[PDB]
């Protein structure tokens, strides 16, 4: 913790200026008790000036996000495939910092927007900082970095009025998607449940690009990075995400914070797919193309180590806001590929930190510093924090005895470009013909989802495209969807009253791939941290008694339990007024409370119908719901919830109720409650 | 070093990026050996981006300057006059940093321009950083801060062509001086020897403004700060300064550096004049007026302690360039007065550091940090280096137990405004009538100079005004000068071919004041560090033996000896090609070298006449010169220098030569060699 | 020109703020005639804030310099060798701006330091701005851009004391030159009279690098840019340059200003050496190597047009 050396404690002591002079900061200096404020009030000005300059530009993308500290532990000595020092011994531990994010919204936008999500991991290795700046979706919208402002301008708010915030549901985005068909693969992922994850802990991370692992002998293999969640994969449903955006814009950052504080810090297996250089085009697409995945059937995952997040930042601004990641932060044993999206990224991340930091010495901020000595001839610049002793900062020199020395493949453990890499041909601004198949892999992805997942994706597209005003853009969108799947274009067209174009089967096929479905990936492996809302009443002393007994039983198994009542008191966490179904992964009514759910309910302490609305919403959104007490039928009738439904629980016995209700939590969503196209 | 904790050592090790990855930095990554450079070359881009951003804006004024670390030691417990902690005990020591500067020139301009000089001192006290931002002249050009950009625009280069650099010798400067008569006092100081000091070590420092000392009981006294040089006062002559500006633009910074490295670190007595609040108008002028001195006859200096500079910086940029002084850096026991120049300065220095530093956390740069803990609720901002633990940074609070506490007169040793201070009357943009005598003190100053000093001042005015093209500006200048002294206006007028206006005696008097004269302040109190050039030859093994014997005898008394000859070899420091009279305080020819001084002397190794020119220039500029060995008449006749002249030495004996010559160095300048008007 | 539309005239009128409100700027607002200055004095603070923020970072190299406006006139239709629009017809005129400079000194350093000199020309062409950022010496010290901070750190002042200003006469410079032998060619030029020119008008300019002329059909030829002074070539002597540095630090900018004002605006012939792609290695060195000239005996100069500088800037900072 270079973070702990820079920590500042203010738990005792008298207020000082920034130069250590004790002062006051509550009243301005004035000429007389009702007089004007004086220019000589240095206390006033130092304080306001600091306030007035507190903000810094938000990131150009991924502005909305949150971070945590942890550790990476290697499972083996990986010398045989990479020279990377953080992977060179069983059990070797490296500190990490991770930031998760959306792409499109500004700071302050809602966590539960539909979007691609960032998953950026810094490894503070003993041979330098290494960053993997990935996303929760393994493919990207575009095939060349020069198009990135085009993609981003199209998805961000229309620039006359700056509407809409954090959403692709507008003409410009679908105009771009429909004119730039490379977008189809990422679009399909973003329109699935991968666009609205349950939490940062319930998504995967991917490096997206093919990279190289380079051995000390100089041989190389091609790799893709996969961070596979140990919490399982899980999504919201859209109608739930929308309400969550309003009720709790901070949902994902709160979830992450709380999991870490409770001792449930999330984990991922850090994995690679590893293939030979000769396989760059063996799989029916080009490994230089970031719109393509390698099916796991062609290349299995190898598990390199464990990533665990287990500590929250001390100061959000200083750590999370100021962390400045770069794919250029590379270490010996890793190399780039000629992926034209990766290639341009290298430029952008060094440049953009000048905007954020306002000066060139951004690598000296505590969160950006390495954990090894720095020896170089970089000097001066605004905000220079070091006092360099070497007064001959040039190479070659004799007056500093030739130091710092050059590092390279054979000296000082230098980074070196993989020596088998070559280039040949004309200097061109031309797209490789090997990149031209934009529709096959979207179809592979779509084929690999379950029927209800396919319906959710169609429904997401129906939602967004129905909000596009241009009839031409809508037609063009159907044209592109039709090339992936005639069925998708037909079902989407039905919602927007246009006809789909005739089937064009060039890229149609029936193939599937493992591991891309959320709903298909079986029950969650753990239910720790999941949220249960127990709906109770201060009316009946039996209701708070039953709530307390359920609480014990659920908290035993690591669930986070919230007892809801009309008013706060001992045992009650939340009022009906502040409660919502978006707040819980499952809801239980204690039978003691059945009168609150009648249609003539009414209280000055919460909005009309709130108790029942929580229960109904939770049911309609596919959550496990139940009534505990043995007079269940009255609440279930008021809800129009069938007692015999999957994921509906009714028991008098607390112990039997809990046992089945917990199986429901693992199932997580009951997908039989959602209507499917015929 | 106080700043040891921020030092970075590069005396060993391999080159790394700023994030600790070992790299190389000598060849670009290319596609083929004769190929184009690749964008993925992160080694290139990080290195060049840093270089591309090395520069920061130069200070708006005082851009050209140099600094050093040292110590202040109090002579006493000054409780009786101030609560200031750094003055509260005999022998109490406080680290300091001082920067000296010119005013008008940009950061690569010559040290030996004619100008006002800056003398800015930071005291890193145990109750906060205290800065005295002074000049080497005790009065300022203007009476209101709002006029500062007018003054500075007028003296800086003309904004169409940015000519001339670091000089007042142009129409705009003299236009402003003639139209704004407040300028007269400082103008006379600037045109005296005080405009072209021999070194930073041979000038005084002044706070200029009246300030207040405040006791812990709340009573106050008015003070002026005086830093009185223990090295004595000394000036260049103009014709010398001009040549030095070209031969060694770094003259003052080099002199300071060298004095420190040789163990001759310069010293000042830190003094105050102290008077009662009741005396603010008792001396015939207003103590709020920064164009006035308090004659020493009315208020003597109290010596408070010793300022010694004895350590050079390690990195100029990080220390000297980045030091950000403010008169707002004040400590308990000191307060401001209603001097309208001081009042506006308090705003400027906080604001201008945003420009220099490019962000609001400039007090976190090592040179600017205090040497005591910081406890405040200032947060965020670009370049934030701290990780603040207190997550409730507001007052008033209970969630951080009311910390940090408010400090004031009665708790926590807070700063407090002197409680006797009041204000009365209309809110006005009007000048006090008490400020209106612009001419009496300029006349007091002029009257207090010796006849030769008066001549030099006149000659500085004749030089500068003769370069003003506008006949009307020149007439306007003589109108103002004439109000100070009819004689001055007459003598100046004679050079520029105008008639002086008739005498106007309203502000004429015959009064004098002690201690403002340089010439009249007797011989220097020490000659340590003064420079002696010995002009020798490799022709004659005799000449180099004489030079070696002289050198040993002069070095024993701490003079810096340079032996000069046609070519370097053992015992010879400099060639005639690189030598100039501007490089010496005294010049000695060894008589074995007499042949070099003939008119038909000529060599491919130095410009024609160079040896003799050094001697002649030294004589004409008032320096002690001599011939050592017994045979003096050929050199002295070649140079047209009378053997019986004051400050001309001829002896055979090295011991007798040096005993006489050292008296000459202490005299420093022989003023009988300069012609007087009339 | 675009320069005229942005010009602001202050030869009449009352003082205003930046937002057009008439104001005064000579006395601070105070609580009584001998009182403290008020925070509500917006006239004071807008003025001093602007002053406080006047400066910008100097250029990392070529900080010390001066500029003038002028015209370039093509001598012919150069279609046969380049598609460049500004060279596509006899008599075609294109506005230019040129800045001349030293390399090593800060703002405020003397014009007559010994140094390589900058000669940077912007052509505001009808198909976009085209800059030739050249020097008065045709070859450069180093063969790879990555080394540029090394060269510059070595020649700039020693970083503990920032001594010496605008000068290669110190250990670090000569350490670098002696350890990096690519430097020798430029070093010889800088140690000649080319290091201390008499004026900006009495030096030539060079693009240094080999560039390509490309025709509309896509064929290319290798070129070197030479701007050849019509005023002739002239130098100071060193002992004169040293005194001049002290007596008149603005010597070259004054000389340029004065020549233009007197109707003696300086001229250059803008020239190229033009060789085939196949001759990249034909002359006993590599045309990709910026430490090498092509001897005029092997490739003669072709005169493309006339560069004339004939108007001084209105505002130095802004232009
Ligand atoms: C050419 C530009 C460009 C391209 C093609 C990309 N990005 Fe990027 N990305 C940026 C330019 C950029 C940026 C503007 O440079 C950002 C904003 C702030 C920053 O540090 O970098 C950024 C931020 C950024 C962040 C946030 C890092 C953090 O939490 O601070 C993530 C996770 C990604 N990007 C991930 C990706 C992935 C997985 C991409 C494709 C595979 C991708 N970006 C393509
Ligand atoms: C209203 C503006 C204003 C006024 C009236 C003054 N100054 Fe000032 N001064 C500045 C505005 C300023 C500044 C723009 O704020 C500078 C530039 C850099 C900095 O830190 O402050 C500055 C710098 C500065 C420095 C350089 C400090 C260093 O070495 O970094 C000195 C020594 C002084 N000044 C001294 C004075 C004296 C003795 C004054 C009158 C008694 C004076 N200044 C009036
Ligand atoms: C990799 C960095 C690098 C390299 C190898 C060079 N320069 Fe450069 N040059 C810069 C980096 C730079 C810079 C840091 O980018 C400057 C500073 C100000 C600016 O606009 O660019 C610059 C300024 C600059 C200027 C001043 C322009 C003006 O008047 O505003 C000239 C004339 C040159 N350079 C000319 C050259 C020549 C003829 C070079 C070799 C043939 C050369 N430079 C190599
Ligand atoms: Ca739109
Ligand atoms: Ca900025
Ligand atoms: Ca002028
Ligand atoms: Ca050096």
Author numbering:
A (entry chain B), B (entry chain C): 21 to 698
C (entry chain A): 21 to 339
Question: Any passages from the paper?
Answer:
We have previously shown that in addition to catalase activity, the catalase from S. thermophilum (CATPO) possesses a promiscuous phenolic oxidase activity in the absence of hydrogen peroxide.
This suggests that, as proposed by others, the reversible inhibition by 3TR is mediated via an allosteric effect and that other molecules binding to this pocket will also have an inhibitory action. In summary, based on our structural, mutation and kinetic data we propose that the pocket at the entrance to the lateral channel, occupied by the nicotinamide moiety of NADPH in mammalian catalases, is the site of both oxidase substrate and 3TR binding.
